[model samples]
Target: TPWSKSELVRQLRDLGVRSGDMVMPHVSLRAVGPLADGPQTLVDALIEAVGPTGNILAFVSWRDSPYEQTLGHDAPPAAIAQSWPAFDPDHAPAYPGFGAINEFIRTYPGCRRTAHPDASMAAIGPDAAWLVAPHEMGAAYGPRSPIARFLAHAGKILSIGAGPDAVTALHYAEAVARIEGKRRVTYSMPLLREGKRVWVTTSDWDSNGILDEYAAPDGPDAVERIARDYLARTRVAQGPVGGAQSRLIDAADIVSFGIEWLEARHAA
Candidate 1:
């Protein structure tokens, strides 16, 4: 079990993760069960396989449960919403490794980690922060993902998942990245690093969370289809935002989920 390092490396490489590239992995821990090693082991194996050339990023999808106590009350639904058994890991109650991504970021400076109040899923990578916005973290984080960023960065992506639905990041890129709007804000926060605290000012509106779908059994996937159909109907500049599949994500949309308030279309 612990000796699967080489095999793990091969798997990552086959997935199109090259050396010197940054990768963010969204994991369903309970899903691994006996086949995959626990979180730390798998992560370390990934790093070794990527070698000095690449880095691995990961996050637990913490946003699915809004009422969960670990994240506290202010936490929104998308950030704290419930998860479907089909998507959730078994036996991983109370947040994986107690939200390892936050601790990882604080402890490992080379890797970037940001907490999303709306999205509980954690993502990891050398450039993980560059690809994902902290605010758009509801229901399977968007705004950025490993495979999506890889495609955005390279114009193509190669990834290996067990099956189609397993390709979560790619789907978000296809479904969420198509929105053609932007939101901006100027905010400041104090954070601690290596026992040192500092304040930083950030200006970017990750406010528009996508809650247009999910009114019923068909709601979740319907959201993606709607976006896909909408984009096909309109014409816009096809660059950074246009080219990538998940550029439309907004932090606010995610936060709204944390609160469990749905937009009108969700009534559809």
Candidate 2:
């Protein structure tokens, strides 16, 4: 059958995704609205798609909540990234939207959910720290998700999507460069999680659609262009940040960037 459930399961089985391997699926809710059964339906489909033998991982990033007000027009969150608990069912709407995977992690203990690269420390267990963080192809999307840490070393990285502004994994390389010693630093983000206000560090943001903004040489202005442009000029720097698209993301577009490393490193 073309889209039969059994066929879906069979395809997953063919992929060798039995019950134990970890899988992180990045998705676009709006993109799948016509086919998927809303957000909740997507979650259910994935669980079954992987079968009982395979565990699922995913990134659920949604910035639409009546509680979290944006001070500056429609600009995304500032420095701090917010994490809301799974919907309480008693008082909240159907989906807080962002907590789908977080909730799934709890329901299926055998599974693991890697943090949105910037938010890796919050993953369920000690293994959370093990989640890989990739360079942000663009700061416009959010923080790089943890997938990069593991993907970069691979011999080949296959990326889909057109345009030059969407590569977010590359930003992780810059973040790694600023990691000094073993201290956890605090970042003040403007986004709210679960109605409470707080600060978020690199490990708290999401990288789901970062490419939407910077996947091309669309740097907010000239600053980011110069930095990324200079990086592409070097041999040691290749991968994400300076890739064809990232060199164009805007620098001023950085929401709550206090760090100077990225800007300084690739400054032309």
Candidate 3:
């Protein structure tokens, strides 16, 4: 039987995503089971869960970022001198890796997306502008990013079959951690300035191996551990939404707890 939109809404509610709540979700559409209308149904359910006043947000990165136009991460210095089309927030398609659900939100009517090529975000509903405006070109996942703004608004992070590993809010904690030997990575991408394309450089936390020297599991696994530990401490609602398992966690609480976890791990 095809799952109805109402059933999706109920599942979201059961997982603690209340109507009129600001939500940032990481979803895996394939894991969510068969729907009457595929990705649009999930997107519609998220919007309806938030209602007209609330907002729904997702990280909808550029599918072909110039940052990776050359050799992976070690692009030659010459690569930086080359020209690439500038990022156009209004027109760029969401990276397919984030799933079609995010692309639906990215192109949805009345939706807005940030200008950052590699760290872009898309949003819908009343707070859409506030959530995505002026996203950071540098420090892409730090205090100046949309993830931070979501925290300011007391938002929630929803994982729909995406697992704790997909929780982006945890990155903000890594950006703020005072870990020893913290590192940064720099890269450039094109952006529209006035009417012409211009290259811009940005430096951000070295996420690739930010924790390689520590007892933690490189980068992503540490985040999953933190999320799991937090879940153990707090009653973040988790259950099935359609055919997929889902979890909803308080944004502020997770970031706060994650920061402390990082601090303790690196306390030397």
| Residue-level error in angstroms, candidate 2, position 63 | 1.7
TM-score ranking, high to low: 3, 1, 2
By summed lDDT, the worst window of 10 consecutive residues in model 3 runs over 68-77
lDDT by residue (1-268, candidate 1, tens digit) is: 3325455555555544456765544333333333344445556655665557554544444333332232222322332233322122222222444333233332344544444332333334555556454433232334453334544553221122222223234334323443433223243332333554333334432322233233235434432344344346544222111111122222232223322322223322
Off by over 4 Å in 1: 1-3, 26-37, 59-111, 120-151, 155-214, 218-220, 223-268
Q: Give the alpha carbon lDDT tens digit for every residue of 1-268 in model 2.
A: 1233343344444433344344444333333223223344445554675445433433333233322333232333533234433222122222234343334433444334332222321222234445433322223223444544334222111111112222233444333334332122222233334775433333222222122232334444222443345345433212221111111122222211313444453332
lDDT of 3: 0.80
lDDT of 3 by residue, 121-234 (tens): 988888888888778677688887888899999988888888677787888988898877676777777788898877777677765445665335544466778887987788
TM-score of each: 0.43, 0.37, 0.91
How many angstroms is residue 44 displaced in model 2 relative to the true structure, after the best TM-score fit?
2.8
Clashing pairs in 3: none
Error of 2 at 65 (Å): 9.6
Q: Sort by lDDT, best first.
A: 3, 1, 2
lDDT for 247 in candidate 1 is 22
Q: Could you list the CA RMSD of all candidates, in the order they appear?
A: 12.2, 11.5, 2.5
